[PDB]
Ligand binder design. Sequence first.
Ligand SMILES: O=P(O)(O)OC[C@H]1O[C@H](O)[C@H](O)[C@@H](O)[C@@H]1O
Ligand SMILES: [Mg+2]
Ligand SMILES: [Mg+2]
Ligand SMILES: [Mg+2]
Ligand SMILES: [Mg+2]
Length: 90
Amino acid sequence: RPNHTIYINNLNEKIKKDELKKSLHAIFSRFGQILDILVSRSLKMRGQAFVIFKEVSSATNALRSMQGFPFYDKPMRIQYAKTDSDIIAK
RNA sequence: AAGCGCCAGAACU
RNA sequence: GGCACCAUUGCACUCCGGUGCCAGUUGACGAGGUGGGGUUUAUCGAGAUUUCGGCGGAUGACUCCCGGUUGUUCAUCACAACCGCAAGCUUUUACUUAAAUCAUUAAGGUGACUUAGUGGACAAAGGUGAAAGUGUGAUGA
Ligand SMILES: O=P(O)(O)OC[C@H]1O[C@H](O)[C@H](O)[C@@H](O)[C@@H]1O
Ligand SMILES: [Mg+2]
Ligand SMILES: [Mg+2]
Ligand SMILES: [Mg+2]
Ligand SMILES: [Mg+2]
């Protein structure tokens, strides 16, 4: 179902952790207030992100508008997160 | 300101 | 930490697949010490993940040569042990700021770590002064 956090994958792996967190705060700021973007570069989490919006409504507009968007030469793939992130739980 | 300086191994990022 | 390649299309709150090539970082805490030449693996303790491993210095040690001191006062040659603006040996005696580690808390840095402050201590060698003992002979004098 719908969620506060959108799971983004198919992102370019060659890009550093910190500059990516700012590169997709540059785009997803349009849809609403972003709390924290979580990005790793490990074998598991290589080329995927978890952008956390304040409101769910913003995450839906983000999924609708940014689906298939070419970002670092690669079209983004956005799904809703399977579970709630441990910052919305509070 | 001379147990002082440097950094090729090693170790850690 | 960073580029190239290999492999990965995937739900997470102390980092975290692999090799290669770079890059960065750590890599001695104070005390002490220089007549000249040779020789050599260069003094003292503190700490305890590398203060390890490598290279460079270096005031060490010995050994000779040079120059001295002391050997009861001032002089020459021996000899003896010393010393390199100090100087025979023994017996005793104050001065001789340790600094890091430790603990802590700010600053910078992506991070490894770095700078600095604060708290409190704890050395050895050395050296510099008391004092009692004591150490030549010849030659002149
Ligand atoms: O300590 P090393 O890396 O062996 O270096 C050699 C010398 O280093 C320093 O100079 C020390 O004061 C000497 O005591 C030591 O002989
Ligand atoms: Mg030092
Ligand atoms: Mg010193
Ligand atoms: Mg060394
Ligand atoms: Mg050496």
